Design a protein around this ligand. Sequence first.
Ligand SMILES: *[C@@H]1O[C@H](CO)[C@@H](O[C@@H]2O[C@H](CO)[C@@H](O[C@@H]3O[C@H](CO[C@H]4O[C@H](CO)[C@@H](O)[C@H](O)[C@@H]4O)[C@@H](O)[C@H](O[C@H]4O[C@H](CO)[C@@H](O)[C@H](O)[C@@H]4O)[C@@H]3O)[C@H](O)[C@H]2NC(C)=O)[C@H](O[C@@H]2O[C@@H](C)[C@@H](O)[C@@H](O)[C@@H]2O)[C@H]1NC(C)=O
Ligand SMILES: *[C@@H]1O[C@H](CO)[C@@H](O[C@@H]2O[C@H](CO)[C@@H](O[C@@H]3O[C@H](CO)[C@@H](O)[C@H](O)[C@@H]3O)[C@H](O)[C@H]2NC(C)=O)[C@H](O[C@@H]2O[C@@H](C)[C@@H](O)[C@@H](O)[C@@H]2O)[C@H]1NC(C)=O
Ligand SMILES: *[C@@H]1O[C@H](CO)[C@@H](O[C@@H]2O[C@H](CO)[C@@H](O[C@@H]3O[C@H](CO)[C@@H](O)[C@H](O)[C@@H]3O)[C@H](O)[C@H]2NC(C)=O)[C@H](O[C@@H]2O[C@@H](C)[C@@H](O)[C@@H](O)[C@@H]2O)[C@H]1NC(C)=O
Ligand SMILES: *[C@@H]1O[C@H](CO)[C@@H](O[C@@H]2O[C@H](CO)[C@@H](O[C@@H]3O[C@H](CO)[C@@H](O)[C@H](O)[C@@H]3O)[C@H](O)[C@H]2NC(C)=O)[C@H](O)[C@H]1NC(C)=O
Ligand SMILES: *[C@@H]1O[C@H](CO)[C@@H](O[C@@H]2O[C@H](CO)[C@@H](O)[C@H](O)[C@H]2NC(C)=O)[C@H](O[C@@H]2O[C@@H](C)[C@@H](O)[C@@H](O)[C@@H]2O)[C@H]1NC(C)=O
Ligand SMILES: *[C@@H]1O[C@H](CO)[C@@H](O[C@@H]2O[C@H](CO)[C@@H](O)[C@H](O)[C@H]2NC(C)=O)[C@H](O[C@@H]2O[C@@H](C)[C@@H](O)[C@@H](O)[C@@H]2O)[C@H]1NC(C)=O
Ligand SMILES: *[C@@H]1O[C@H](CO)[C@@H](O)[C@H](O)[C@H]1NC(C)=O
Ligand SMILES: *[C@@H]1O[C@H](CO)[C@@H](O)[C@H](O)[C@H]1NC(C)=O
Ligand SMILES: *[C@@H]1O[C@H](CO)[C@@H](O)[C@H](O)[C@H]1NC(C)=O
Ligand SMILES: [Cl-]
Ligand SMILES: [Fe+3]
Ligand SMILES: [Fe+3]
Ligand SMILES: [Fe+3]
Ligand SMILES: [Fe+3]
Ligand code: NA
Ligand code: NA
Ligand code: NA
Ligand code: NA
Ligand code: NA
Ligand SMILES: [Zn+2]
Ligand SMILES: [Zn+2]
Ligand SMILES: [Zn+2]
Ligand SMILES: [Zn+2]
Lengths: 424, 426, 425, 423
Amino acid sequence: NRDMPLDSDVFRVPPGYNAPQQVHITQGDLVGRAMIISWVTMDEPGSSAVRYWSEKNGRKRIAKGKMSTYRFFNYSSGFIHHTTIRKLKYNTKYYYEVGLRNTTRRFSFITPPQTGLDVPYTFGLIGDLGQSFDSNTTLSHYELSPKKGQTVLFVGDLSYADRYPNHDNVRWDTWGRFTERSVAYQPWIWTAGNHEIEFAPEINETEPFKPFSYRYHVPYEASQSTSPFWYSIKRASAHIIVLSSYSAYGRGTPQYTWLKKELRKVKRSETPWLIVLMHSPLYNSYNHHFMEGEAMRTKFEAWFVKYKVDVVFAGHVHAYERSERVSNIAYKITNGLCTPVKDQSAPVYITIGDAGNYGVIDSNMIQPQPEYSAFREASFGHGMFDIKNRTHAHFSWNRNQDGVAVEADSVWFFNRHWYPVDDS
Amino acid sequence: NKNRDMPLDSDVFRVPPGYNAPQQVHITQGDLVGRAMIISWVTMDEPGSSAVRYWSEKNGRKRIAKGKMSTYRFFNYSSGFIHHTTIRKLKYNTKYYYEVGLRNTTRRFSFITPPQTGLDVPYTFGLIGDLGQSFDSNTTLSHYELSPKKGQTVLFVGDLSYADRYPNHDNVRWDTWGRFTERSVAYQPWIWTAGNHEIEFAPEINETEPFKPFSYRYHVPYEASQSTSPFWYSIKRASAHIIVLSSYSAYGRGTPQYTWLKKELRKVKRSETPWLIVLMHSPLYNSYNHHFMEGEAMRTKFEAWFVKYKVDVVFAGHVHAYERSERVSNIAYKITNGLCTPVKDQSAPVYITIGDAGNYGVIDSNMIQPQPEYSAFREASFGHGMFDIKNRTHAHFSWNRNQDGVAVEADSVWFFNRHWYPVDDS
Amino acid sequence: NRDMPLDSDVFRVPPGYNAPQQVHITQGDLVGRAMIISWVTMDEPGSSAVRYWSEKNGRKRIAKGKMSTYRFFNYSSGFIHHTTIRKLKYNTKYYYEVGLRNTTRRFSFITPPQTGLDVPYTFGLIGDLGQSFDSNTTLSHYELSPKKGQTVLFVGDLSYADRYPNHDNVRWDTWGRFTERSVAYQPWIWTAGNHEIEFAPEINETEPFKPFSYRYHVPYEASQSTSPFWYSIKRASAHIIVLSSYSAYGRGTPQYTWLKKELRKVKRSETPWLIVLMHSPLYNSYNHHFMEGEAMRTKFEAWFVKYKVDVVFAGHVHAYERSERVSNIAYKITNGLCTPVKDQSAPVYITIGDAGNYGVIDSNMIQPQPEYSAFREASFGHGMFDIKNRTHAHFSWNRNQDGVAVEADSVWFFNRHWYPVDDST
Amino acid sequence: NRDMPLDSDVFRVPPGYNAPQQVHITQGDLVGRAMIISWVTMDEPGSSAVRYWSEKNGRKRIAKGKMSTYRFFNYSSGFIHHTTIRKLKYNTKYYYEVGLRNTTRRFSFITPPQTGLDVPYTFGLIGDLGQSFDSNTTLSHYELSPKKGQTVLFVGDLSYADRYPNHDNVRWDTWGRFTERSVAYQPWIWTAGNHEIEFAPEINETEPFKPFSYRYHVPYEASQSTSPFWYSIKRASAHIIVLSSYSAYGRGTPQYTWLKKELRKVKRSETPWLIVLMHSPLYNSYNHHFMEGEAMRTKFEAWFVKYKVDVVFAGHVHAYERSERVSNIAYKITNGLCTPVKDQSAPVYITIGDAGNYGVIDSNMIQPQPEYSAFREASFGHGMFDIKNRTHAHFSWNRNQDGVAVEADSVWFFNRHWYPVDD
Ligand SMILES: *[C@@H]1O[C@H](CO)[C@@H](O[C@@H]2O[C@H](CO)[C@@H](O[C@@H]3O[C@H](CO[C@H]4O[C@H](CO)[C@@H](O)[C@H](O)[C@@H]4O)[C@@H](O)[C@H](O[C@H]4O[C@H](CO)[C@@H](O)[C@H](O)[C@@H]4O)[C@@H]3O)[C@H](O)[C@H]2NC(C)=O)[C@H](O[C@@H]2O[C@@H](C)[C@@H](O)[C@@H](O)[C@@H]2O)[C@H]1NC(C)=O
Ligand SMILES: *[C@@H]1O[C@H](CO)[C@@H](O[C@@H]2O[C@H](CO)[C@@H](O[C@@H]3O[C@H](CO)[C@@H](O)[C@H](O)[C@@H]3O)[C@H](O)[C@H]2NC(C)=O)[C@H](O[C@@H]2O[C@@H](C)[C@@H](O)[C@@H](O)[C@@H]2O)[C@H]1NC(C)=O
Ligand SMILES: *[C@@H]1O[C@H](CO)[C@@H](O[C@@H]2O[C@H](CO)[C@@H](O[C@@H]3O[C@H](CO)[C@@H](O)[C@H](O)[C@@H]3O)[C@H](O)[C@H]2NC(C)=O)[C@H](O[C@@H]2O[C@@H](C)[C@@H](O)[C@@H](O)[C@@H]2O)[C@H]1NC(C)=O
Ligand SMILES: *[C@@H]1O[C@H](CO)[C@@H](O[C@@H]2O[C@H](CO)[C@@H](O[C@@H]3O[C@H](CO)[C@@H](O)[C@H](O)[C@@H]3O)[C@H](O)[C@H]2NC(C)=O)[C@H](O)[C@H]1NC(C)=O
Ligand SMILES: *[C@@H]1O[C@H](CO)[C@@H](O[C@@H]2O[C@H](CO)[C@@H](O)[C@H](O)[C@H]2NC(C)=O)[C@H](O[C@@H]2O[C@@H](C)[C@@H](O)[C@@H](O)[C@@H]2O)[C@H]1NC(C)=O
Ligand SMILES: *[C@@H]1O[C@H](CO)[C@@H](O[C@@H]2O[C@H](CO)[C@@H](O)[C@H](O)[C@H]2NC(C)=O)[C@H](O[C@@H]2O[C@@H](C)[C@@H](O)[C@@H](O)[C@@H]2O)[C@H]1NC(C)=O
Ligand SMILES: *[C@@H]1O[C@H](CO)[C@@H](O)[C@H](O)[C@H]1NC(C)=O
Ligand SMILES: *[C@@H]1O[C@H](CO)[C@@H](O)[C@H](O)[C@H]1NC(C)=O
Ligand SMILES: *[C@@H]1O[C@H](CO)[C@@H](O)[C@H](O)[C@H]1NC(C)=O
Ligand SMILES: [Cl-]
Ligand SMILES: [Fe+3]
Ligand SMILES: [Fe+3]
Ligand SMILES: [Fe+3]
Ligand SMILES: [Fe+3]
Ligand code: NA
Ligand code: NA
Ligand code: NA
Ligand code: NA
Ligand code: NA
Ligand SMILES: [Zn+2]
Ligand SMILES: [Zn+2]
Ligand SMILES: [Zn+2]
Ligand SMILES: [Zn+2]
């Protein structure tokens, strides 16, 4: 229906023999002194080396990485490169080059400041991007934001290649080339959504998350996680926890065990902003995917309140919603306590899965609007979480049909540790 | 005192004599309908042969099936040589002998294949959970094997050896458990469910593959029901369709297990197997203090499916005690409508917790008071269950306590089939 | 450059979605009751199932096999299928079909007679085939031969894909489509030559024989070999031993150990004809590859004499040569005994690497023709080893430039065990 | 049976919980600035970290390595560690420590001087060592040599564990503990002999060299080899080429292809001494294994003459032999040129497989002694290749029945590139 055609300008192939394409970066360590650099070469393996240097020092260094390939049904990937640059200086612009053997391409990024209590930083929020014309408009709006996002928190559902026949993994390549104009210059922090599962036993593809996991690496060992699908990083004044809605989280499982330990490592005097990313929302008053989040909610919601998470970001529902600060953790089967109540130790739950997908919005809502829902609207767009300091962060939502500087919704987050005031 | 595990020199742990004698012999159903058997054993002195020699009493024709040997390491433990061999194309309702260790020390055993699946085929299933290797465990197993109801197959709802309570999960305690349970499971299949003591996720000793020792030692015929994982699968046996679930695997919407179960419930034909039985480790209904509400997560996913498909019974363990629910459901909840109380629902399964076979000697006696309406009967005693199918409409469940005689049932109830005879059996 | 271009008729793709191509069969067991069926599908994995039935009876059965794929530099193969049909009846025509899920293709083969002393059987001899116009002519001559070859003994150097840039493995696919018109209907017995090594560290391909070994499977475990590159089969009245010139054969290595035990298992009272295949010739009087066979000769020649091997076939030299029965096994470094002498207990050594390759013949011969060389000529062509009974086999060599019925060289073999009499020309 | 029993003092287990045992080192790079550190822990995996520092400066650094395990029939190995220390300073004594988590053990080595034309260096030659009482004597004689060996060139046949029932791989562990008293302190340069093949299809062990290759790593990638069984290193003024008698070496095979290119890289103005190690001798006048080396000789002898190899060392024959400088490379099947002739561009071929094995010597010799044989004797012992400078190196053979300072055979090597005097 509305997916951009293969010959669209956003899908053009970087010219020259074996030119790197689908270039993308993300944070490569726990505190921001490292960057994972990733790209694909189509004509031959090529080299996995990255040349990099700061604008100031100017001393050029080489980092070595690794190449991998995969198959999916009758698809054969090109040559995938992942290379980690390490021991970078904080708050510094670096250039990097890939394709060192045949066609070199140059890019740049800016390391975050060192982690600290009072360190401003602006996060973009994008979920369920896809590669429709709507997707392209959302990305344009983010790039043109006057607030200037410095990192994208991506709440999952990347390419939607699995909607195509045999999950036509070409649509992973096109999505890589489409997003390069943003993610080659600033990290995107990856969350796994249901369109990344790609469980297709009918064509003998039964390894969950396979194409996504080959194409997008994350620094999961840096937080002592055993799986790429849940992990944490710190960046500026934020501690960001990424969870996997489609992995196990029963008591005693790896993800549950890891998250319980991870929450104990949080130090709000170093990173006052505690942020959780997951694909499927625990609070959601849209009909589509209603109550799908209940299972994870039974395991994790009380932990979020106990540790005073500031905000939880999710996607999956193709629309926008912002909850009140509520909790629904008092239920004991026979005591009848199953209704959410205002709770100032609880996070705000934000659904931001509306960046475009394959061109369809979720407009059917549960009626009436429940007390726990502060704002909801079925429009395309993206968010910005703008940390001013340890007490204040400004969240805004920009609609695709508005000007790039118009915020149809916006709210001040008051920090749950340093300033726990009603921000209704 | 504090430790009730049986000592390493106990008679139940003795090593069968002879060079490279097979030990830890165990069998389970090896296909979808009962014409195959997975034969498993360990040799300790050298790899040995994975051949099984076998013959029916009725035809006396000796045959050879070939299998595979495997090994694993766990921290500083190195396993012996694990053999799994599937015997196929067995005749129904037929007694077979089989032999393992064909190269050096041969040992002979026997089993009886079930009748062909069918509407009115009687069959008696044992129910054992959280068995362990304490003296209480030995007593439960004795009561099972001395039962005049005579179980023909054990439905085992998880937590096997409890080896993971030992330092570095001392996998020697898996070997002892295998030698101990052999006197039953070498002669009749046990249907394996994975419990939380099978997870053995221990990153501090760089052992991060969930279920590894369990999965090397206990194979299941999971491909036969088009499952992609040993931890959830289905078998049919006599008049029963048995669905085994994994509490400690993913079951979110779109995951392999969730996808497999949705499809498997639509393949169920109650005109062929009228008794629909679900095994899982962690109970969805549980009024004991220990592990209270741990099953809530899977309940939000699957309970409505069990009601829609009129599951007859759900068996679970994990709680070290016995409980039998009423037929109830709690599937009307919509966040803001306040409908969170379980109600009687004749379309729902009975939920039975039967994790009381012994573990490491500890019973769970703290119950939430008063007994809730959804709970029909509960008791903190060691024992085992029996699910005795008479025909498409009637099955008789009974619970036997270790402190009673082997022929005494302390709880019992008639199941009226939800598909063929849905009359009120409360 | 005389390689046939890609649009040649011999390289055409079988029509229909995911149609099997590059179909080829070989013996699948030790004695001839089994057949390995191999093929590639290009559009998607497909089924590895093979449907088969005998022409007279007709009970259609299914055999299940395996699919594999590989990469070589920036090449990605299609989906390779290998499936063994077992427990066939001897001397029986069978139909078989592949591509069961989408586009089915049907072929046939005739199982050999049960092994016996006097069982006639006609073996083709083809080496260093390649895909030039000369290659196509040789294959044409073989398939039109009035002698009617029933199984090809192939002494190595298949596709010559490794002469292309990055070994362009597309030229393995084309060769499979070209050869199918013969090897889909009768087994070819595969020997690994030096163009199969494909050792290319400069493009990080360091696994020897990788493309060859993915595409061409052999029944090596049936003779207790641990490697596909050396193995043994029996067919009709012949015991055939296949060796790897480019694998280790020092004392104590797998191949040396295996050959030693295998020769002990030979029973000439059951299979009278003992035949060795290897790529590199032990006896070779051409300048090209002169004396490359010496290393293996020092290890195995004395064994071939001890066990009275009837014939040894090799390729590698792009020409034809037939030796006298000779041996060179008395050398002791300082005793001066280094000349081949006549030896009635030795095999005849035949170089038959002249099926066409990429169109070049090896014409530089060392002069004069040495006493050990009975006949040699630098012409393209192929051979036929035509077994008549336990005492007599007729060998003939047919040149591409002659008519298909013209034997330019021809000799009767007297079996070294059952008719140990001088058969020299 | 003359193998030392399991309770011999040489086989004592280092005490302490999870104490490293079987510690051994070898050169870790092409030119000598790196060291592969190897050891086994038996009680649990432990850490693969190596702590090391130079004795003068003293800055303590950590290198991270890798742990591996293997099975052979019914044997399960301990936890094998391999860790490369890199970027070391030349001609410098270093301390290193293994077993950093529970029981630490400390050793030392001395890096060689930087490669160069006139750098002196003393190499021990040991072959077919084994773990018999003769083996212990040879190793004692080597340790006590007044010439002071600084690196051992080991021409193969290590533990002889494969003579035991099911190749009882415990006899690899005992050999590792026995040789530690030398190889933990100076590199041994490993060659693979026939007792390392361990190809045993009758007990379903069909991977050649499996136990050896898990236990003893070599820096084969540093010379662009694709296999651990052939490689080259440079140390001081020597270029050392290690070949594999029981791998493939036909034309076009990886080993053949590698050797041809490696010989092209030798620069005799940087390393004047060109040394080849292989297990099976190309020249051998003993009855045992006579002419087993002919196959490799047909492929590589002409290359050795063409590139003027100084010396070729081999083992396999359980005895000592030293050849004249000869070549036998003119044979063309019919031309009758099959007798070795004096050739001053050819190497000397030395058989030194007499360090003890399991207690048997090879005494039956071809009679009369052929002209290509300069000296031969069936006694246990070891050799020393003592490089003085670019022109002169002194080779000596010490018998176990003699005093540790007595040379029963002794010859000057005159360098084939800088001083090709008739020797
Ligand atoms: C599917 O399985 C269920 C469970 O097994 C079947 O239900 C059982 O059916 C059997 C009959 O086959 C019932 O047993 C019978 O019970 C009567 C009534 O006993 C009661 O009253 C007596 C006085 O009237 C008293 O003496 C007795 O102590 C008890 O209090 C018995 O009278 C009867 O015994 C006599 O008849 C048999 C048959 O000729 C003789 O052999 C005896 O020697 C006696 O002369 C017999 O034991 C049993 O009670 C049922 N169990 C339950 C839990 O309901 C079911 O059968 C079907 O359903 C039942 C309710 C009846 O309608 C059956 O007729 C009917 O077939 C099985 N379904 C099918 C389709 O087979
Ligand atoms: C084993 O196989 C060989 C080769 O086929 C047999 O030798 C061949 O026997 C043929 C007879 O069946 C000969 O053909 C005849 O030749 C005569 C003389 O010109 C013609 O008049 C007649 O019409 C036939 O064409 C053929 O010449 C001969 N081939 C050779 C190379 O010698 C062999 O048969 C046995 O040996 C020969 C020499 C004769 O004595 C046969 O009669 C005899 O049976 C076969 N062995 C057996 C046991 O059958
Ligand atoms: C696997 O690793 C565990 C953990 O280290 C081993 O268990 C430990 O063995 C130690 C012996 O090396 C024990 O220490 C000694 O205890 C005795 C008796 O109290 C003291 O007299 C002595 O001075 C030592 O302190 C240690 O207690 C034990 N640790 C634990 C947690 O059990 C294990 O070794 C195996 O089990 C023990 C019980 C001994 O019998 C060992 O000999 C035996 O190998 C390791 N297992 C394997 C298979 O290697
Ligand atoms: C695997 O890698 C090889 C080696 O590069 C690829 O072949 C090469 O493909 C390039 C095009 O990308 C060819 O260069 C072009 O040649 C034409 C004709 O002269 C010229 O007009 C262009 O401007 C450009 O320079 C190159 O010749 C060719 N080399 C060969 C065929 O040897 C090959 O396509 C790759 N295969 C796969 C499956 O990716
Ligand atoms: C963190 O950033 C906040 C957003 O800029 C600060 O609040 C803003 O402070 C301005 C000057 O102090 C004032 O003009 C703005 O109206 C105000 N904005 C809002 C939404 O309140 C905040 O400043 C502190 O907190 C406020 C409430 C005042 O009391 C200021 O005097 C404080 O300095 C910043 N907080 C810190 C700790 O720096
Ligand atoms: C390399 O070392 C050789 C062994 O020491 C030197 O030969 C020795 O030179 C001594 C003078 O320093 C002399 O006393 C010894 O007789 C002699 N030893 C032998 C076995 O010849 C060699 O010296 C050169 O070569 C010899 C033959 C003499 O002509 C010396 O005067 C030369 O300097 C050393 N070569 C070099 C280049 O240093
Ligand atoms: C995508 O958006 C960019 C920037 O807004 C625009 O230049 C480009 O034409 C768009 N491409 C498509 C296919 O809509
Ligand atoms: C190959 O030979 C066949 C049979 O002689 C012929 O029909 C075909 O045209 C030839 N193809 C070539 C020469 O490309
Ligand atoms: C081995 O040799 C050493 C050094 O000479 C000696 O101290 C030791 O006792 C010997 N051990 C045996 C078992 O011969
Ligand atoms: Cl749980
Ligand atoms: Fe989505
Ligand atoms: Fe339990
Ligand atoms: Fe050729
Ligand atoms: Fe030896
Ligand atoms: Na909970
Ligand atoms: Na039978
Ligand atoms: Na879900
Ligand atoms: Na060769
Ligand atoms: Na040898
Ligand atoms: Zn989604
Ligand atoms: Zn449990
Ligand atoms: Zn060749
Ligand atoms: Zn040897």
